């Protein structure tokens, strides 16, 4: 992995991002969920790099990246991604993928950096903003995580993140996810929670998209259910919708081979 100071149009103008960059060819940048880190996408990075260039950053405030206290808007996160691609000399088009919060970042990127997208991969996410109660709950999470750390978040989220089959067959995957949460920087988690609260409604962005889009969801996703994701996909032109069996909210970790395959086969067409 690498750690580089990049120039970003978001405050504070410069930020240090940690990231993986593996393979050659078409660039595919994959964005993790909340409150996880780049290792969420490790199986896909390690497998897809035989055919594509896979770039996987820790977002601001997560993993090994710089923590910028206050609010980390989805726009700011997207600006950082643009600045990373600029740093790397990927100044043309990329495929951008994101899971959950990372999908919110992808929407912010598509808003602002349309002409940099060859394609979008939207996993286990939604285009609607937070409801008023959801916003308030973000503020409560932010306030508490700054003081107590993310243990309470792991306790609340783990049962909602993965399906029953994962708990049974892959307890090691559960534990990897738990350690990602437990290790997340408290002020980075707070800043992202506040950023999620403030994110705009992307509903009307979707019909205006101009690149092919893959929409992927776990069969048993409790957080962004498949029914709602299918409806979201029907608003996106040039979309493909895939349900990953025997996965909850984290298909890349729960069913890594099936996710890698779905992405690989879709990328081949974007690419050809």
Assess contact for 262 and 244: CB atoms under 8 A. yes
DSSP 93: -
Is 199 near Cl ion (CB under 5 A)?
A: yes
Instruction: Identify the residue whose tokens are 């600006």.
Output: 79
Closest distance of CB 11 from Cl ion, Å: 17
DSSP string, 2-41: EEEEEE-SSTTSEEEEEEEEE-SSSEEEEE--TT--GGGG
The phi and psi torsions of 229 (rounded to 5 degrees) equal -65, -35
Kindly state the smallest distance separating residue 253's Cβ from Cl ion, in Å: 23
d(CA 151, CA 139): 17
Q: Could you tell me the smallest distance in angstroms from the CB atom of residue 160 to Cl ion?
A: 14
Region 128-147 residues binding Cl ion, contact defined as CB under 5 A: 130-131, 134
User: Is 122 a residue that touches Cl ion (CB under 5 A)?
Assistant: no
104 contacts Cl ion (rule: CB under 5 A): yes
Q: Does 108 bind Cl ion (CB under 5 A)?
A: yes
Question: With respect to Cl ion, which residue has the nearer C-beta, 46 or 130?
Answer: 130
Binding test (CB under 5 A) with Cl ion, winner from 74, 153, 191, 253: 74
Phi, psi of 197 (to 5 degrees): -60, -40
Assess 126 for contact with Cl ion (CB under 5 A). no
Which positions from 142 to 181 touch Cl ion by CB under 5 A, shown as an x/- string?
A: ----------------------------------------
Rounded Cα distance between 217 and 249, Å, is: 7
Instruction: Name the residue with the smallest CB distance to Cl ion.
Output: 134
- Tell me, by CB under 5 A, how many residues bind Cl ion: 8
Place of tokens 């895939």: 242
Q: Where do contacts with Cl ion occur on this chain (CB under 5 A)?
A: 74, 104, 107-108, 130-131, 134, 199
């Amino acid at each position: 992995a690498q750690r580089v100071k990049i120039t970003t149009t978001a405050t504070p103008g410069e930020i240090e991002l940690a990231f993986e960059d593996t393979g050659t060819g078409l660039p595919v940048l994959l964005v993790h969920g909340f409150p996880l880190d780049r290792t969420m996408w490790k199986a896909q990075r390690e497998e897809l790099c035989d055919e594509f260039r896979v770039i996987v950053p820790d977002l601001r405030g997560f993993g090994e990246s710089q923590v910028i206290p206050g609010v980390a808007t989805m726009e700011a996160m997207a600006d950082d991604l643009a600045g990373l691609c600029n740093h790397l000399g990927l100044t043309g088009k990329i495929v951008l993928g994101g899971l959950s919060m990372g999908g919110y970042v992808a929407f912010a990127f598509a808003r602002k950096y349309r002409d940099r997208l060859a394609g979008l991969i939207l996993c286990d996410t939604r285009a609607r903003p937070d409801s008023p109660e959801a916003k308030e709950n973000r503020r409560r999470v932010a306030e508490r995580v700054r003081r107590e750390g993310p243990g309470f978040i792991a306790e609340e989220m783990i049962p909602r993140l993965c399906c029953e089959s994962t708990f049974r067959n892959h307890p090691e995957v559960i534990e990897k996810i738990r350690q990602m949460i437990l290790s997340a920087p408290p002020e980075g988690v707070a800043a992202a929670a506040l950023g999620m609260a403030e994110r705009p409604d992307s509903t009307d962005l979707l019909p205006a998209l101009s690149c092919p889009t893959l929409v992927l969801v776990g069969q048993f996703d409790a957080i962004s259910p498949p029914e709602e994701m299918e409806a979201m996909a029907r608003t996106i032109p040039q979309s493909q919708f895939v349900v990953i069996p025997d996965a909850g909210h984290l298909p890349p970790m729960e069913q890594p081979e099936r996710v890698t395959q779905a992405i690989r086969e879709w990328l081949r067409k974007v690419h050809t």
